[PDB]
Structures are given as structure tokens and as C-alpha cells.
């Protein structure tokens, strides 16, 4: 019962992009891109934001860029969590749509919506020279120490 059932596991075949996003809570300036295994990668400065904003943005940006299936993996838990909260509970009773980010949260929805199948998952932040090691990178320069 949702607007959307996301996958259960990787969509083989499809292009997967490594999403992440970084702020500087002192300043509010972050960025927020992604990597892909077919050689894409874009990264986007933005202002008045936060860490949590900026790994939305970055979700974003990856509906935005994708195909019609589309696999996206984020490092953030309140990402994933607030997103796949928001497609299990509509149309339904006791939902309390959320506070914060709501206004990101929804252009997100919006663009969802719009894909044959979306597989979204989560991995800790972890060193290496895997996808999420590298848009990290790309996100952290100039915002945050590596
Ligand atoms: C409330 C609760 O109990 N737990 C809870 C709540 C929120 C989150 S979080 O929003 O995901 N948050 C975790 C700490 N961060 C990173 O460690 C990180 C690491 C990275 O390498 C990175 O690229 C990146 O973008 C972020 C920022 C993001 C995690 C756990
Ligand atoms: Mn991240
Ligand atoms: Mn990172
Ligand atoms: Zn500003």
C-alpha cells in the first residue's frame, strides 16, 4: 500500500549512482553530486543548507539525471529512511507528514513516481576506492576535513 514499491534488490542491468552530500554547519555551504559506473558524475555548490539537505539534494539530483530504472546508493540514513517512510505510509490514517525538509522530501517524491523501478539502499560511510568513497571526496572538498 504505497505510491511505489522500490525494489527489494539491486536492479540488475542499470546504471547505479553512488550519491552523497556534505555541509559545513558554521557556514551552511555544502555540496551535494553523485558518481555513476557508466563514467557520469556531476557535484552541485549549494548555500543556506545542511547535511541532511544536501544528501536529499543528492537523491535528487540522481532521479533527476537517471533513466527509468535507476539503482542509488546513499550513506545517509535519514535519506533513505524519511523516503521510504513517506511511500509506505499515504492515503492512510495516523501519518504525520514531516517537519523538516518537507518541501525536498517532496520534489522527491515527485520525481519517484515517475521511474519503472527504483532500488535505493544503504551502506555506512566507509573508506576504499569504491562509488561512495569517491563522490564523497568530491563532496567533502573545500566543506569538510577527509
Ligand atoms: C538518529 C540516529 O539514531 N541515527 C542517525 C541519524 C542520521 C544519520 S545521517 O543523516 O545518515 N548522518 C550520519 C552522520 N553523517 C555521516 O556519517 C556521513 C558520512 C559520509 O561519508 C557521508 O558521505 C555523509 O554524507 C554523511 C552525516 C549523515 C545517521 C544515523
Ligand atoms: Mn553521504
Ligand atoms: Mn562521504
Ligand atoms: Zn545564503
Same mark, same amino acid.
Given at each position: 500500500?504505497?505510491?511505489?514499491?522500490? /525494489?527489494?534488490?539491486?536492479?540488475?542491468?542499470?546504471?547505479?549512482?553512488?550519491?552523497?552530500?556534505?555541509?559545513?554547519?558554521?557556514?551552511?555551504?555544502?555540496?551535494?553530486?553523485?558518481?555513476?559506473?557508466?563514467?557520469?558524475?556531476?557535484?552541485?555548490?549549494?548555500?543556506?543548507?545542511?547535511?541532511?539537505?544536501?544528501? !536529499?539534494?543528492? $537523491?535528487?539530483?540522481?532521479?533527476?539525471?537517471?533513466?527509468? /530504472?535507476?539503482?542509488?546508493?546513499?550513506?545517509?540514513?535519514?535519506?533513505?529512511? $524519511?523516503?521510504? *517512510?513517506?511511500?509506505?505510509?499515504?492515503?492512510?490514517?495516523?501519518?504525520?507528514?514531516? +517537519?523538516?525538509? +518537507?518541501? !525536498?522530501?517532496?520534489?522527491?517524491? /515527485? *520525481?519517484?513516481?515517475?521511474?519503472?523501478?527504483?532500488?535505493?539502499?544503504?551502506?555506512?560511510?566507509?573508506?576504499? $576506492?569504491?562509488?561512495? /568513497?569517491?563522490?564523497?571526496?568530491?563532496?567533502?572538498?573545500?566543506?569538510?576535513?577527509?
Amino acid at each position: 500500500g504505497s505510491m511505489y514499491q522500490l /525494489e527489494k534488490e539491486p536492479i540488475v542491468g542499470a546504471e547505479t549512482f553512488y550519491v552523497d552530500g556534505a555541509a559545513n554547519r558554521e557556514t551552511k555551504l555544502g555540496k551535494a553530486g553523485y558518481v555513476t559506473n557508466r563514467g557520469r558524475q556531476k557535484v552541485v555548490t549549494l548555500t543556506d543548507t545542511t547535511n541532511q539537505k544536501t544528501e !536529499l539534494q543528492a $537523491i535528487y539530483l540522481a532521479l533527476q539525471d537517471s533513466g527509468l /530504472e535507476v539503482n542509488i546508493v546513499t550513506d545517509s540514513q535519514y535519506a533513505l529512511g $524519511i523516503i521510504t *517512510q513517506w511511500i509506505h505510509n499515504w492515503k492512510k490514517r495516523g501519518w504525520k507528514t514531516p +517537519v523538516k525538509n +518537507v518541501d !525536498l522530501v517532496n520534489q522527491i517524491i /515527485e *520525481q519517484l513516481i515517475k521511474k519503472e523501478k527504483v532500488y535505493l539502499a544503504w551502506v555506512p560511510a566507509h573508506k576504499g $576506492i569504491g562509488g561512495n /568513497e569517491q563522490v564523497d571526496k568530491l563532496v567533502s572538498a573545500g566543506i569538510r576535513k577527509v
